[PDB]
Amino acid sequence: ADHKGRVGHVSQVIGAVVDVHFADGVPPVLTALDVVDKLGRDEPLTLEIVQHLDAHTGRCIAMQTTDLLKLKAKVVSTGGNISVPVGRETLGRIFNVLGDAIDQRGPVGEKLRMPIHAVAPKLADQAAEDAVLTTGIKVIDLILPYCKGGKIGLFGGAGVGKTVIIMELINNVAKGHGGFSVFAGVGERTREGTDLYLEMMQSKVIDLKGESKCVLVYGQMNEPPGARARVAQSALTMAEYFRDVEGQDVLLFIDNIFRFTQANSEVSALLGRIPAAVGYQPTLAEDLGQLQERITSTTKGSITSVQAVYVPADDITDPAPATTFSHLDATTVLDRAVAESGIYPAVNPLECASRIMDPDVISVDHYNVAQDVVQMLTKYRELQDIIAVLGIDELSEEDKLIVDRARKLVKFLSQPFQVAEVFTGMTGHYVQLDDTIDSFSGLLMGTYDQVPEMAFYMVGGINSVLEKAKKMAEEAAELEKMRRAR
C-alpha cells in the first residue's frame, strides 16, 4: 500500500527477465510494475517482481514481449500484486492474466478486484466432512463420484468428446447446485480456444443476450512463459471470489495442468535456477502445492477442479504427472475404443478411480451397488475372453445371465447430454443420484430381465428405459401388423 506509484528505472534486460532499480526501495515480491514508456510498443508492458537482488534492485519477469525496451526506462509500481476483476460481471467474458477483456465486447464494469496470489485456506477453514458432487451423469455419479473441493484428473486427449463433457458439467453444476464455472486455458492452442468459445456460445452456456454460467481465462502458447504461469492463478482467484463471497460450489477447469508445470519450469530456467531431476524446476512440488491447496471445500463454499492431465512420453512415473497425482482425488479416463463403440460419454468404468468410494463417505447402498457393477463388468470381460476362445454356447446358465446383465449395464451407462440437443436432436437427461443407485440395484438383482437390451441405450433413469421399451414394443407390433396385411 505504501509503495503505490513508486518510481523505478529499468537496469537490465536479458530476454524475458528485466531488472528494475528503485531509489526508494524495491516493492514486495510478486508486485506488478507498469512500464510507462510505450514509445513504440503496440501493447502495454507489465513486469512481476520475482526476486530481490539488493535493497534497491529487483528482478522481474515480463508478461509480454520486451522489444523496444531501453535501459533507464521509467517504471511505476501498481501498488500490489496483479489485480483481476471478480464478480458476476465477468460471466460470459474472456480474460487474460492481467484480467483484461480480450473478447472486444465492451467494458467489464467490475465493482471489485482481487490479487492473483492469495494464501490457501487455513486448517480451520476446511470442511467438516466430505460431500459428493452430483454431476448428473450416471457413470460419474455411480462409479467415480466427485467430491466437493476435490481435484479430478481427466485423461484422454481429443477425439473422445472431452469438450462436450466439460460443457455438460458446466451446465449441470449450475442447474443442480447453482454454482458457476471458470475455464482456464494454460498453454492452449489459440484455434482450440476459439472453437471452445464458439461451442459454448452455441450451447447457450455463454449467452451474450442472456445470462452466462462460465468465465474464460486464456493464456495462449504465443504468450511468454510469465503469463502461462499465472493464468491459472487468475482463474483460481475468480473461482475463489464465488466460493467465498457468494458461498457456492464452483467449478474450475484447467487445460492442461501439465502446461502450468511447463510454464513454471521455463520461468525458473530463465531465472537461472538449477533444474531438478529430469529437468523440472527445483520448486516443482511447491509450485503445484501453492495452486492445488487453494482448491478445496471450505466452510463457506467449495471449488471442485476438473484438470486435464497429460503424461509426457507415456511415462506415468515422470516427475510432472507423478507429482500431480499426489493432489488428485479422482480420475476420469476417456478411451477412443469406447467412443467408437457408440457409448457416450466415452468413459472406461474399470480404468477410473475415486477416493470417496468408501462407505464412510458415500451411502452404504451406493458403495455396494458400485462394487457390484465393477465386479460384474470384470466378470463380463472374463466371459468375453472365454467366449472369444471357446464360444457363447459353452457358458453355463449363470454365465449367460451375467453376460446379458453386463451388456445391459454397458448400454445403460451411456447418456445423452442436454448440451447436444441441437446436434443429436434428442432431449438430454439429468439423472438424480438416488435414481441411478435404485436403477442399477434393480438391474443387478434381475428385476429388469425382460426389457430388451437396446432399451437401455442412450437413456436416463429407469423410467426412460421403460418408456423406450414400450415404444419399441409398439413399433414392433405395428410393423408386424402391417406385414400380416401384405
Partner: protein, 146 residues
C-alpha cells in the same frame, strides 16, 4: 502480408530442427541458462510464437490464412526428443514418415497409424469427405485383419 489482405499463404520450414540448434548456439555463446539437451528455456516459446502466427482470420478481417508445414527430423524414430515433442505439442496433428515403408516401396511413406489431423473432416471437400468417411473404416478393418 497476404493473410492480412484476404489471401491465403502456405509457409514451409525446412527445417525447425536446425533453427533450434542455431538458437541454442546463440544462447550458449551469450551465457544464458541452458536447459534440457543444452537448449535454453525459450525454445518452446520460440517455436510456439513462430507457429502460432499461422491462423485462419475471420470473415471480418478479410478471411486470409497462413498454413504452416514445419518439418522435423527424428533420430532412429525417436519422437521423445526435446524439440520433436515441443513441435508436436504445438502443431495441429502430424504426418509421420516411416523408414521401413519408404524402403519397402510405399512412397510417400505416410504411416497412417501414427499420423493424425486434429482438424478432422472439417478440412475436406464434400466429395472427398464422403469418400474418406468409408475409406477410413475400410482401411482400419483391413489393418485389423492383416
Amino acid at each position: 502480408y497476404f493473410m492480412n489482405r484476404g489471401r491465403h499463404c502456405l509457409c514451409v520450414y525446412d527445417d525447425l530442427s536446425k533453427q533450434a540448434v542455431a538458437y541454442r548456439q546463440i544462447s550458449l555463446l551469450l551465457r544464458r541458462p541452458p536447459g534440457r539437451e543444452a537448449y535454453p528455456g525459450d525454445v518452446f516459446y520460440l517455436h510456439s510464437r513462430l507457429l502460432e502466427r499461422a491462423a485462419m482470420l475471420s470473415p471480418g478481417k478479410g478471411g486470409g490464412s497462413v498454413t504452416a508445414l514445419p518439418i522435423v527430423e527424428t533420430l532412429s524414430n525417436d519422437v521423445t526428443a526435446y524439440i520433436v515433442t515441443n513441435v508436436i505439442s504445438i502443431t495441429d496433428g502430424q504426418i509421420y514418415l516411416d523408414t521401413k515403408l519408404f524402403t519397402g516401396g510405399q512412397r510417400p511413406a505416410v504411416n497412417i497409424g501414427l499420423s493424425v489431423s486434429r482438424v478432422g473432416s472439417s478440412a475436406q471437400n464434400a466429395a472427398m469427405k464422403g469418400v474418406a468417411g468409408k475409406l477410413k473404416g475400410i482401411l482400419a478393418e483391413y489393418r485389423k485383419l492383416a
